[PDB]
Amino acid sequence: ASKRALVILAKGAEEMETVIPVDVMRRAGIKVTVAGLAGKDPVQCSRDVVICPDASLEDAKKEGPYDVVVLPGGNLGAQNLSESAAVKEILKEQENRKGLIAAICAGPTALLAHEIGFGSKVTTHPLAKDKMMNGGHYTYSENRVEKDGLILTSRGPGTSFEFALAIVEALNGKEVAAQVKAPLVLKD
Template structure:
């Protein structure tokens, strides 16, 4: 798209959010909503299909398309993994997700995971040696692997990997993604109308 102020061509940023059955619905919706407020083009992709997905609290979310179709429309600037124990296990067990994450990391793109979803990073061998955080329920697993430096911070960014702790930190998580992709000023602009503390 063109910037009206400068006339300079600006490449639109693109995010892929992978939605698995049993995902934490707050993490899925907050991440998608906040990124769209920042004018990031978000594709919400169903892990198994484009059919409605039942999340961890029985909220039903309809993805934009299947992950298979979304992959064909790549590449993406960031791949986002919402948590939820059931959803995270499906992400960790999925060969499709493994392929997407390996390709994303190989291309130098961002990867983000919240709550229990960092366990999928471990399962697929992604972001080894990085500092990360997670929900406490998967902390021991991540620490015991010896693959990461674990932090108790609410949101951690280490290079191209962004992780966070859970539903209560998800606005901060999403704003950290916005900052990484389009800058801190945009993150501040969208935080205000949502009545969030400025970043």
């Protein structure tokens, strides 16, 4: 009776955008797997923080399904996500089974690369807007967190807490989100 989250971690990911959702989701009782795109080895993030993944993506793929798939940002991280055929397979399967897909900052650009969720309202980091909107396949929002159907997006490192709590609210409900929020000492 435990919800499951997959966080996909590639070289160049924004480490704040990775750790904040993982930590908050584990505070909410969610079973989180931090899966390394290239394997089980330690991943050098964009600001040189080095994180050990829980598993390789190959292994984690086989322990599905997941109630949410999480794509952090970071420009080079999103580029690696966008180029990965394994990411494409995971995202297409999540869309087909109507599971949640959550991406933050530059992360949403991987959705475009993999042709995921066309027609949805999305947000990105302002600097990633032009890339996300190539072709007019999505409608753009400037909300700090945006949710349309099964696609949940958010704008930047500074929105990481709101992004994570929205995942909690979607999976476990508003009361659990509010309970997890209070000890964090967030402003609003």
